[PDB]
Design a protein around this ligand. Sequence first.
Ligand SMILES: [Zn+2]
Ligand SMILES: [Zn+2]
Ligand SMILES: [Zn+2]
Ligand SMILES: [Zn+2]
Lengths: 380, 374, 380, 381
Amino acid sequence: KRGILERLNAGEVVIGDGGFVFALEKRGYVKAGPWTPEAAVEHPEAVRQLHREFLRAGSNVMQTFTFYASEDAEKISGQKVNEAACDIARQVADEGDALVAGGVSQTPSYLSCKSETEVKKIFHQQLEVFMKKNVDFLIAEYFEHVEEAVWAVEALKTSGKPIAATMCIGPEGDLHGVSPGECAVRLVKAGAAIVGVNCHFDPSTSLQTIKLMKEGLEAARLKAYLMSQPLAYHTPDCGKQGFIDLPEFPFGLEPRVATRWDIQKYAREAYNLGVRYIGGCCGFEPYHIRAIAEELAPERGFLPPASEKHGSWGSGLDMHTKPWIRARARKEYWQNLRIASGRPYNPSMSKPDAWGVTKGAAELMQQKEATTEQQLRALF
Amino acid sequence: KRGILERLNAGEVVIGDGGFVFALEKRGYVKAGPWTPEAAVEHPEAVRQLHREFLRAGSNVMQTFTFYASSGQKVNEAACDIARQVADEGDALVAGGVSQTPSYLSCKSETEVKKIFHQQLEVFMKKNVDFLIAEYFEHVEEAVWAVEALKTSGKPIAATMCIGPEGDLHGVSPGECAVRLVKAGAAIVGVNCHFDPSTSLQTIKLMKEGLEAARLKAYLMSQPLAYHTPDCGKQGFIDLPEFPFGLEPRVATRWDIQKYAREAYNLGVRYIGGCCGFEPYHIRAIAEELAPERGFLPPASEKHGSWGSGLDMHTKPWIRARARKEYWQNLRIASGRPYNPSMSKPDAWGVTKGAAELMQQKEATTEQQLRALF
Amino acid sequence: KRGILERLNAGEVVIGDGGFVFALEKRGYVKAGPWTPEAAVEHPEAVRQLHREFLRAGSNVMQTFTFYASGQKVNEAACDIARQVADEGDALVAGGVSQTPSYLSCKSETEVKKIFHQQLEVFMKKNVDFLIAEYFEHVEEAVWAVEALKTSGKPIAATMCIGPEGDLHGVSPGECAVRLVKAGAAIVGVNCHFDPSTSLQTIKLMKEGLEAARLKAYLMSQPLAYHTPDCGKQGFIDLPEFPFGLEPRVATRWDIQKYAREAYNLGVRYIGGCCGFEPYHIRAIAEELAPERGFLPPASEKHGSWGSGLDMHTKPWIRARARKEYWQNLRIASGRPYNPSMSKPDAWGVTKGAAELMQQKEATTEQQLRALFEKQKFKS
Amino acid sequence: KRGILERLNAGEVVIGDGGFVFALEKRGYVKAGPWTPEAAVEHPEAVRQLHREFLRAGSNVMQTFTFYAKISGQKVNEAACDIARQVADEGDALVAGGVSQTPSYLSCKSETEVKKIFHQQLEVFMKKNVDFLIAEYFEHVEEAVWAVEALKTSGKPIAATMCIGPEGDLHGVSPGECAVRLVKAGAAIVGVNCHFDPSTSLQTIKLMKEGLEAARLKAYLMSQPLAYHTPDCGKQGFIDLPEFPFGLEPRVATRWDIQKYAREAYNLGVRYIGGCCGFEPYHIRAIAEELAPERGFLPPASEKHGSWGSGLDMHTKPWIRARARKEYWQNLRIASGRPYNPSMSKPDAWGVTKGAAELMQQKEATTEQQLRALFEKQKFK
Ligand SMILES: [Zn+2]
Ligand SMILES: [Zn+2]
Ligand SMILES: [Zn+2]
Ligand SMILES: [Zn+2]
C-alpha cells in the first residue's frame, strides 16, 4: 500500500515499534550480554507473537530482529537467522497497516580505527539481505559518531530505498564533539530523508536534542522528517554514554520504566515539536506503543486494535464497587499523580559508572587525601 | 506422570506460574476494569505464548485463564484446553481456580454462593485438571466454603489467601485461617497476591505457626505481588493510588525475586510462585535460585547467566565488573524519579463522620486565635 | 511563684525546654562521645545564652546541664546558671538523673541507688523546683530512681526513651506508667530515642495502662526532633547517621506544631523536646498551644503566625506562602536525590557465628548454581 | 595585627564566618519578616555569643550584623560594629563591613542616587575602623561594580562576591566577565555567595577563575555558599524554592558535606572560604578542620570534637564504634527520614502568558474529548 515517504508526505504519523530485544530477554529468548537474535529460528513463534503485539498496539514498523554475523570453515548460520527474522517480520507486517525496516548500527570494527572502506563493507554485507528480502526502507541507528553514521547512510543509499537515521546521543553532542544540529545536517546531506535520535536517553532528554537537530536543519535550509525512539527508562541521572553507564544497567532498571501516562506526555510533546515518526527503544513494551497511538489518535483519526482492551484515561475503572478506585478513571488524576517508588531505602538517582579513569588521580589525590587526613589527625 | 501431591511428597519444589492477567493487559489482550479472559477464544495464540513463556521459565503449573461466567463457558473451556496443551509440552500440571465472589459480599448464603464454586468445578472436572486452587480470598469464612465445595472433586486442593499478617476482613488471624483451611481439606495452604514478597512471607510464618500449634500438617504456598508495597495500609495494593496504571516503579527485579525465593524455601514453603506483576523472568528467578536444590535449570536459563555473568564480555570494564552476585544483590537501584516520593498513603475510606470535618474547623479556629495573639 | 504541680493543677500547659547537649555540640562547647557539661565552668556565657534562648522561646523548665562526676563544681556551676535564667522568667529549674552502667554491668539496687542519691544531694542543696528521672529504658531501674528521688519530697516527673513496644526488660508501656506512678511519679511520659509521631503512640498506651488501673498522673513527652520512621528498637542511636549525619531528619517548626497539637489533644500537659530541639522548635510548641494558654512567648516577637512575615516581599509566589494551609501541607524535599529516605539500623542481632554460617550457604549456593550453568550450557 | 591582604599574601587561608541572620532567626532574635538586626541593641548578649561561636569555630572574619535602612537604625548599625570589633579582638580575626543589592537599582534609581546609599553605609564603617569591606549579595555586576567603586573611596581592601551562578548574571553577564569587571573596578578579592549550594557555587568560581586568567587580571578567590543542598534550584536562588525559608531543614549540609566542599574549594584555588545562610558554627569548624593540615592548626572549637567521628572510639556498642572513621562518614548516603516526600521540588517562577496557557488546557481538554469519542465508536463494531 503506502510507503514510508508517502505516509509522511500525506501528513500521517508513523508509529514505530518498541524495544524488541529487551522484551524477549524478559520473556526468555534473548540473552543479555551478546543480545543476539538466534531465536528467530530457535523459537519463531515467540518472535512472531511480539511483532504481532506491537502491530496490535498501533506500530507501523516491524524492524527486523536482525544482527551483524560473520562469526565463523569461516562463515555463518547467523545469516539464516537474519533471513528467518526478516521473513517473520514481513509476515506480521503484512497482517496489518505496517512496513518492514532493515537496520544497521555502530560497528565495533570501527572503534579500532579500521577504515571507512572496511567498515563500510559491513553495512553492505547486511544491506544485501535487506535487498533480497525487499525491505520497505532502511534505518541507521544506534550511533554515537556521526562520522560513522554518515558512512552508513551513504552505504545504504546505494539501495535507493528511503533512509532514516537516529543517533544514540542526547543534549551535548556526539563523541567527537559534533553538536546535534551539525549531525542532522551532515546526516540529511548524506541522504537521510528521516532523522532523529534513538535509545540512550529517556523521553524528556531525547526531545531536547530533537529541538536542537530541528534547529540545525532549519538554520541550513535542509529539510527532513524528525524521528525519535527513546528509552522507556527515566534517566535524569544519566551523565553520559547512555544508561549503559548507569549502575542498574541492565538488570535493575525496573523502577525507571515509564508508565503509559509518561509515554502519552512524551508522544504529545514529540508531536507538538514536529516529530512525525514516533516510536521507542529499550524498555518499550506493547502498551507503551499503544500509549503513543492513543495520545495522537485524535490527530490520526483512529485507535489501534489493542485499544479494544483499554480505555481513555483509566475509564475501565468506571465500574468497581469501590468509589476511590472509580475516582481514578480520570485523565486529570493519572496525568498528575506522582507515583511512588515503593523503595524507601533506595535513592532516586545514581552516579554513572564513567570510570573514564582520570589516571593516577585515582591514586595521587586519593593518596594525597589519605595523607592530609593523617596530618590533620596529627595536629589533633 | 507426577501429580501435585507426589511432587511435594518426593521433596520436590513446585514452581508456580506468574501474573497471567496483568501480563496480557500490558500485551493488549485483557482490558483493565473487567479483567476478563475472552482472549482465550479471540486470540488463543497470545494466551498460548504466555503459558509457554512461563513453562519455559520453569513454572510447573499452568493455572487456567478462566473466570466466572454470568458464551463465557466456551471461553473457560477454550482456556483450560490451551492450558492443558502447554502443560503437556513440559513437566507441568494444569490447575483450575476459583476466588472471592461478588455474591458473598451481597450476603448471599452459603448455599447460593457454594453453587458458584460448583458451577466452575464442573468444567474443571470435565477437562481433567490435575488439581484445584482456592485463591484470592479475604474471608476464610468463604474460602473454607470453597475448599469444601471443591473437595467434592476428590482432587488435591490448595487454598491461598490475600490477607496480611493481621488476619482477614473478619479478624481471623493467619494461623487460625491455615488451620480452618486445612481442616476443611486443603492439602496445600498459603497466601496469594495483595502483598509484596517480604510481607507475604511474614504471614506464612504465622500460618506455619498456627498449623504447628495444632498438629495439623500441610504444604506451604506463596504467590505474592512482584510489586514493592511497604506503604500498603491494608486491603492490598488495590487501595494504593497507583493501582493499577502507575505501579511500574514498584516492580521487583530478578534479584528481588531470588532473595524472596530463598527466604521462602528456607522458611519451608514448597510451592513458590507469583501473582500480579510476575513476568516470565521473575519465575525464572525463583527456579534459578533454587536450582542447586532442585538439581536443574529451567530451559529459559539458556538465554541467561548466573548473576550478570553474560556481562563477562563487554569492552567496558565497569560493566564487566557488574557480573557478580555480590554486586547485584547489594545494589540499591534508583527510582529515576527525583520528584516523586518513595511511598504513598492508601486511599481506603474511613471517616468524614464527626471527625474529618472538625479536622478543619478546630484547626481553622486555632490559626485565628493564634493570629490574634500576634 | 507557681510550682510544677500547681501549674499542672491549674490546667496550665508546661512547656519543656529542648535538646541542650546537642545544641551546644553544634555551637562548639560539648564533645560527642563523652557528651559532658564542663562548659558550665569553662564557658558559662554560652550555657547561659542557650538557657535564655529556650526561656525566650516559651520554655517553662530549665533542666540542669548536669552530669555524673572537679565534676561536682561543674554540676553546681550548672545548677546556678540554670537557676539564674529560670529566675529571669516564668520558669522552674529541674534536676535530672538517667540510666547509667550502675545498672549496665548490674551493680545491684543498693549500689546503683547510691548514685541517684549522690546527685540528689546537689539538687537538694540548690533547692531545684522538681526532679526528673529521664533517659530510661528499664522501668526496673527507673522505678529505683523515682524511689531514690522521692526521698527529697519534691515532685517527680518520669520519662523513658522507649517505644510503643516496651522497656528493655520487655515490660509494656502501660505497665511502665503504672509501676512508675505507683513508685511515686506525679508526672509520667517518654522522652528521646524516638521521633514525635512514635513518641505519642506510646503515650496513648501509657495513658491506657494508667486508666485501666485507676492510677492518675500527668502526661509528659520530650521526643527527638528527628524523623525516625526507620528506627528499629534501640533508639536513633542504632541508626547509621547517629550522630553526625542526622541533619536531614530534623523537624521543621510546622512538624513540631503538628506534634504539639496531637500531644495536647491526647492529654499531654508537659510538652517539650529532646535531642534535636533548637529554640524555634520550642517556640513552635508554645505558638501552637497559644490559643489555649492565652499568650505568646517573647520569641514570637521576631516571628509570625504561619509564614505571615512573608506578607511583604515583592515576589507574589513567595507572599503566597504566608499561609498555614501552605506550610502544613507542603511535602518538603530532601535535596539529596542520590540518598535513600530510610536506613536499616546497625544492631547486630546475635546471629553470631551464623553471621558466618549463612554467609557460607549463600557462597556455596552460588557455586553450585555456577556449576549447573556450566554443564547445561555447553551442550545446546 | 595581620590585615586581610597580608594574610592572603602570606599564603594563609582566611576562614570566613557563617550565616548570622538565619542562625539568630532560629534562636529567636531575628524576625523572618524583613530580617533586620535590631537585636544588636535589644539583645547584644545574643549577637555577641554568636560572633564568639564562629570565632571559636575558626572563623577569621566577623562580618558586621548591619543593615541598610529614618528608623532607629544607625544606633543599631553602630552597636553591631562594636560588638563585632569586640569579639574580633578576642581572637585572630578581622571585622568586615558589608553592603548589598538594594531596592533602588531594582526600581532603576540612577547610579548617583543608588551610589549614595553605599556611601551612607560606608561612613559608619569608616568611623568604626572596619578592617576591610565586602560587596556580597549582588545579582547584577552592573550594580556590584558601582558598590566596589563607591567603597574603594575608603582605600580599604575590597572583597567581592555575588548571589548568581554559572548562567552568569541576570544581564547575561557570564561569571568570567563579572570577575573581570569586578576586579577592574578595584576588587582585590572576588567570588560568589548566597543562593547556590556548595557544589554549584564552586562551578561558577572555576568560570570566574577562568575569566580572570584569560585577561591577565589577578585576584583572590572567595566563596560563601548556602549550607543547603539545592540541586533543584531551577534557576533563581533557593528563594524561589517552595521550602524557603521555613522548610529547608532537610537540605542542611552535614559537617562532612562541608569538609568535602572546603577541600574542593581549596584545591580549586579559593583562599577565602566561608559560608552563607544555613552555616552554623560546626559548619565553619568543618572548613577549618579540613584545611588544618595546610593551615598548621585546629580552631579552638575542635577541643570538643574529633577527626572523623573519633569521639565514637569509646562506646560499649561495636557498630557505633565502627563509625569513627573518615571512610564511613565520607561515603555514607544519609537518609532523609521522610519517605512520603520527594527529594526535589520545582521552583516557584511564572511563565506569564495569554496564549497556549489559557490554551494549553484548551487543546488538552479538546484532545481528551476527541479521544473519548473514538473509544465509543469502536466498541460498537
Ligand atoms: Zn535500545
Ligand atoms: Zn493477583
Ligand atoms: Zn537526648
Ligand atoms: Zn545567605
